[PDB]
Design an enzyme around this catalytic site. Structure first.
Site, mmCIF file in Angstrom:
data_model
loop_
_atom_site.group_PDB
_atom_site.id
_atom_site.type_symbol
_atom_site.label_atom_id
_atom_site.label_comp_id
_atom_site.label_asym_id
_atom_site.label_seq_id
_atom_site.Cartn_x
_atom_site.Cartn_y
_atom_site.Cartn_z
ATOM 1 N N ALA C 45 3.592 -2.947 33.107
ATOM 2 C CA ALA C 45 2.990 -3.411 31.863
ATOM 3 C C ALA C 45 2.750 -4.917 31.874
ATOM 4 C CB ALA C 45 3.904 -3.060 30.681
ATOM 5 N N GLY C 71 12.698 -2.536 28.866
ATOM 6 C CA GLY C 71 12.122 -3.307 27.787
ATOM 7 C C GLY C 71 10.862 -4.048 28.158
ATOM 8 N N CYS C 131 4.661 1.055 21.745
ATOM 9 C CA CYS C 131 5.358 -0.203 21.522
ATOM 10 C C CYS C 131 5.681 -0.405 20.050
ATOM 11 C CB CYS C 131 4.517 -1.382 22.006
ATOM 12 S SG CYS C 131 4.779 -1.839 23.741
#
Ligand SMILES: Cc1cc2nc3c(=O)[nH]c(=O)nc-3n(C[C@H](O)[C@H](O)[C@H](O)COP(=O)(O)OP(=O)(O)OC[C@H]3O[C@@H](n4cnc5c(N)ncnc54)[C@H](O)[C@@H]3O)c2cc1C
Ligand SMILES: Cc1cc2nc3c(=O)[nH]c(=O)nc-3n(C[C@H](O)[C@H](O)[C@H](O)COP(=O)(O)OP(=O)(O)OC[C@H]3O[C@@H](n4cnc5c(N)ncnc54)[C@H](O)[C@@H]3O)c2cc1C
Ligand SMILES: Cc1cc2nc3c(=O)[nH]c(=O)nc-3n(C[C@H](O)[C@H](O)[C@H](O)COP(=O)(O)O)c2cc1C
Ligand SMILES: Cc1cc2nc3c(=O)[nH]c(=O)nc-3n(C[C@H](O)[C@H](O)[C@H](O)COP(=O)(O)O)c2cc1C
Ligand code: FES
Ligand code: FES
Ligand SMILES: [Cl-]
Ligand SMILES: [Cl-]
Ligand SMILES: [Cl-]
Ligand SMILES: [Cl-]
EC number: 1.3.1.14
Lengths: 262, 306, 306, 262
Positions: C45, C71, C131
């Site tokens: 990501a 995370g 998210c």
């Protein structure tokens, strides 16, 4: 007193036909075996595959404390494949024996018995013929296979007295070209009891040709989970009693032809 | 003893309970051991009328799990009141039974809840709200807090025994549904029911299950179960019977760390028929290993954890 | 060849794509084989700013799966434009790259989507909407169709490459979200992201993960993935890159039966670093076994199945 | 040219202390080993347990083509437990060797080396001392354990020349009662390089007592997944560079004390 479950020892295991393994199992479960056509519920040696594999008992030897199974394996992601990697001396987690088998008590020397098998439905029919041979009755045994490549147990059946054995293959690679059902249509006597086990289309053909026979015993297969009648995975409709479900694992695997729809 | 646990309607000798739909009504597993060893039993779902259930194939194997789509096959209320429950009462009169109650519409749920408490061995009703609602477009009674609260309150009006609600994991947020159901009078909760899964047969290119979709159970779903049990335990004060993938005394204790007060055991029975008694006997050794004196204390310590 | 497949922005030599967050930006797995064998890569990501991510422990093992809560650790847009993507462009200029794009608020998502298409090897943006949204109470952009459609349409306004959306399985009904996102201009979908799970340490009685909850991936979640891919494929006409528990060429084909056009492979890389090339080479043998001539044909046959 | 992964053969495996097994592995991976303190990423022989188990290389023999590991097992639900059931002759799925090990190139005969180990941090320190013995330097080796019940490798370390070996146990069942850190506080010389591996509280004590030492090498542990630096599971904060994450599996497992916070 019954054992119910046992870590049996695989005595031997060898590939006797294309992707078909013969395993000999030694344990105290063999002492509980009686009717042909019962099965074993086998745990795959792979902890990600939690459902047991249901496999017909093909023959047993009470003195040797051994039973014999013949099973076909899938690809390298299948559980039967994992089972085939087990070696002589390994333990295998068996539940059994399970189910209603083929009845033989009421067979007598006068009767002429017909046996129709196909594919991996054939193994349990061996112990059946083995037991009927003692009752001094005359059997015709018709077995069909996809190919010579998957023919099994011809020699064992041939070494049985009071047995006419005809063998078909769909491709003609061995014996009669075509399906077992064809060799059925050629039957020229009055059969008093028919025992059959194999692929659904074959079981259907047998069930129509002998729909009027009462001693018609059909060994069924199904997807299974608990293997003991608790979970309801393996139900067939009861033909003689609509509004009632038969459980292949516990009512069967062997049923009377009148209990079944196709 | 150490394993003993007390819940609304349940004075359990141990917290191990075969999960609904994985034990039938006990008659088959009884062949393998004395069912008195169990703390309780969640018997197969009861609907008002008989159900043959879904067509076959009904089950499929998955990685560390299974799919099942029997469709709540059961002989219906009358036969269950007359045959199934009395057999358990005769052969195991001291074994408390949890009656799993399902239905297609609210009136059906209510009718079963009015009658089934009459059976003497039935001490708790387990309300299965993961059922399609034919008065709501096929909506599982358990995905909408207001629907669920209405159903609970209606059944609460007729139950002569404490009412537990079995929650479904197939929701965006389980907290509203759990809160609403406690507010409607639920004495306790059980969680979780199955996830939804599909398998395809590579040869036919069609789903393995006739129902296409099936419920996903087994150890594969334990992390999801623990997550939801933990999530709900922070939000309600009624006790929880935890289930999902339990296979070992370790798993039982892990359920306690999440906030459960007793533990149901489902799919593991199919791999190992003795799994429930085996877990019961290895619980004290395993509790010793992690310095836990009693399960009742552990419940209060975790409840205060908080 | 047989394995070749064409998707919006992607002319793939084969459909095997390492999943985002399981391949880094390729530099480590490149030590083990030529990344040109891959069809594409979903890289870690990208967020607008750097993120150290969550505290450790970040991972845990589960039955046929794992939990992860890193995370979204990543060096941020600038470093990814300047270092990570150029390294892949230099060493593998013909390997198309899918840039996974995440964020905390819409402006952040949009800013990344405006810039990252400039990298020459980036052919597709994979919008990660699982998210938490700090303008919506921590609500995952992907649980609400209107939020999700707004985000997609905003990012669609600035992307110089086709925009795919990665859907989350943690919803009551995935069909509204999928419909809304296609309507907002999504060129394709990828599914699924992880489920939520928790493990407890029996000694500390606390969660194994510092984040308490974690994402559940691996073969354990394949039945859920197939269910949701199949469900969505009946409802949209844009293609789907399927993922969740894929481990074998069999699993790839099963993804096709569900309606996927290419298949991403995540957790399996950790058990077997060679799993993606191994799958690529055994695909033709396995397709032979089930009488499939080409993957492109299979896509159309299944699309017409329907 | 590097092998990266190999189905090694377990030569032997035996329980050398309470729940601690010594396994000898034979394969071509041994030829790639150099620095002490690298590790192997072991697949558990259980298909429901997909993450590899990271285990320190304790020693190797390039001629024998063997390496040696010593690992502690968990309960019967753990993967290490499954690994301990593997028998002589079985294959085990190894990735490796992996990581930055203990550097020894700049050690010379003049230097006095200190080694501090605890628990299952001890195995990789054996190959370390084995290599430092060739550099004709004088080592003090302090090892601590919870109990006599889990002491390991005392005899191997004792048979090394140029080695003073002191051993503590928390309960006093063997050698000095207490923790290694106590035997540290008693050090009466100027150490030029310290190598340490063990439980976090011990690593913390060592890191404060020798915070001013530059050649201070600390072997870390972490939860791991990919084992190669791709997945970011095993990050430590970089002390010398806030805003940067160290990865135990790939930057480590061995770090300079200045790179670490406690
Ligand atoms: C009562 C009974 C007796 C049997 N006796 C024999 C025998 O003697 N020899 C023999 O070769 N086969 C026999 N079978 C079929 C055998 O159980 C299946 O071929 C086998 O379970 C397939 O599993 P797998 O590991 O190859 O495939 P996988 O795809 O790994 O299995 C996936 C799941 O589907 C189930 N499954 C898939 N196909 C079938 C099928 N056709 N029947 C039942 N379950 C299936 C498996 O049990 C497993 O739960 C019998 C089946 C039953 C019900
Ligand atoms: C670089 C490195 C080198 C190591 N060298 C050794 C050694 O030489 N000898 C030895 O006994 N141990 C060593 N360990 C610790 C060892 O990896 C763990 O004890 C082991 O993985 C625990 O797994 P399990 O199968 O016992 O438990 P399970 O509970 O079945 O494992 C569950 C998951 O948690 C992980 N896990 C649990 N505890 C730990 C831990 N303390 N460290 C890392 N992962 C953990 C497991 O790998 C697995 O992924 C090392 C760890 C690392 C990171
Ligand atoms: C074959 C089968 C039948 C089930 N039937 C029911 C049922 O009738 N009612 C119900 O509330 N739950 C039912 N369940 C769900 C289980 O009770 C349990 O909630 C779920 O399977 C997760 O637990 P497990 O992973 O330990 O099986 C069934 C599960 C299976 C596998
Ligand atoms: C360690 C780890 C990191 C991940 N990081 C991301 C991410 O950064 N962005 C994203 O969209 N998905 C991420 N995922 C999800 C995977 O890409 C994939 O969607 C999911 O793991 C299911 O596939 P698998 O079962 O094949 O792993 C991550 C998964 C794992 C295990
Ligand atoms: S397999 Fe469970 S009832 Fe037949
Ligand atoms: S284990 Fe994946 S980065 Fe260290
Ligand atoms: Cl004998
Ligand atoms: Cl009903
Ligand atoms: Cl950011
Ligand atoms: Cl040699």
């Amino acid at each position: 007193m019954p054992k119910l479950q046992e870590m049996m020892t695989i005595v031997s295991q060898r590939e006797v036909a294309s992707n078909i393994f013969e395993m000999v199992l030694k344990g105290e479960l063999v002492e509980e075996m009686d009717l042909p056509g019962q099965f074993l519920h086998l745990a795959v040696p792979n902890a990600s595959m939690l459902l047991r594999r249901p496999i017909s008992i093909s023959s047993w030897d009470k003195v040797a404390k051994t039973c014999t199974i013949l099973y076909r394996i899938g690809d390298e992601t299948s559980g039967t494949y994992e089972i085939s990697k087990l070696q002589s001396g390994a333990k295998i987690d068996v539940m059994g024996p399970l189910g209603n088998g083929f009845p033989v008590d009421e067979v007598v020397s006068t009767d002429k018995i017909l046996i129709v098998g196909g594919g991996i439905g054939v193994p349990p029919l061996y112990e059946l013929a083995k037991q009927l041979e003692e009752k001094n009755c005359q059997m015709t045994i018709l077995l069909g296979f996809a190919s010579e490549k998957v023919k099994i147990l011809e020699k064992e059946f041939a070494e049985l007295k009071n047995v006419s054995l005809k063998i078909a293959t769909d491709d003609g690679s061995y014996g009669t070209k075509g399906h077992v059902g064809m060799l059925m249509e050629e039957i020229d006597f009055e059969v008093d009891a028919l025992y059959t086990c194999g692929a659904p289309a074959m079981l259907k053909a047998v069930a129509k040709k002998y729909e009027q026979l009462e001693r018609l015993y059909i060994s069924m297969e199904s997807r299974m989970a608990c293997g003991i009648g608790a979970c309801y995975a393996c139900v067939e409709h009861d033909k003689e009693d609509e509004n009632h479900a038969l459980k292949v694992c516990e009512d069967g695997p062997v049923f009377l032809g009148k209990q079944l729809l196709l | 003893n150490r394993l003993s646990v007390k819940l609304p309607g349940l004075d359990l000798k141990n917290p191990i309970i075969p999960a609904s739909g994985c034990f039938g009504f006990g008659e088959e597993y009884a062949k393998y051991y004395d069912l008195n060893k169990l703390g309780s039993i969640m018997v197969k779902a009861t609907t008002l009328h008989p159900r043959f259930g879904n067509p076959t194939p009904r089950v499929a194997e998955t990685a560390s799990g299974m799919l099942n789509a029997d469709g709540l096959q059961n002989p219906g209320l009358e036969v269950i009141m007359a045959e199934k429950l009395p057999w358990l009462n005769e052969n195991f009169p001291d074994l408390p039974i949890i009656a799993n109650v399902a239905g297609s519409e609210e009136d059906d749920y209510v009718a079963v809840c009015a009658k089934i408490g009459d059976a003497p061995n039935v001490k708790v009703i387990e309300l299965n709200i993961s059922c399609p609602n034919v008065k709501h477009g096929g909506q599982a009674f358990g995905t909408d807090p207001d629907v669920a609260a209405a159903l609970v309150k209606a059944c609460k009006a007729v139950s002569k025994v404490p009412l537990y609600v079995k929650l479904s994991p197939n929701v965006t947020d389980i907290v509203p549904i759990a809160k609403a159901v406690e507010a409607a009078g639920a004495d306790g909760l059980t969680m979780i029911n199955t996830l939804m899964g599909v398998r395809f047969d590579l040869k036919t290119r069609k789903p393995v299950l006739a129902n296409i979709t099936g419920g996903l159970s087994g150890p594969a779903i334990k992390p999801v179960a623990l997550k939801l049990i933990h999530q709900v335990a922070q939000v309600v004060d009624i006790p929880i019977i935890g289930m999902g993938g339990v296979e070992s005394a370790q798993d039982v204790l892990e359920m306690y760390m999440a906030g459960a007060s007793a533990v149901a055991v489902g799919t593991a029975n199919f791999a190992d028929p003795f799994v429930c008694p085996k877990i019961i006997e290895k619980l004290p050794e395993v509790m010793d290993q992690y310095g836990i004196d009693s399960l009742e204390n552990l419940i209060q310590e975790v409840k205060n954890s908080k």
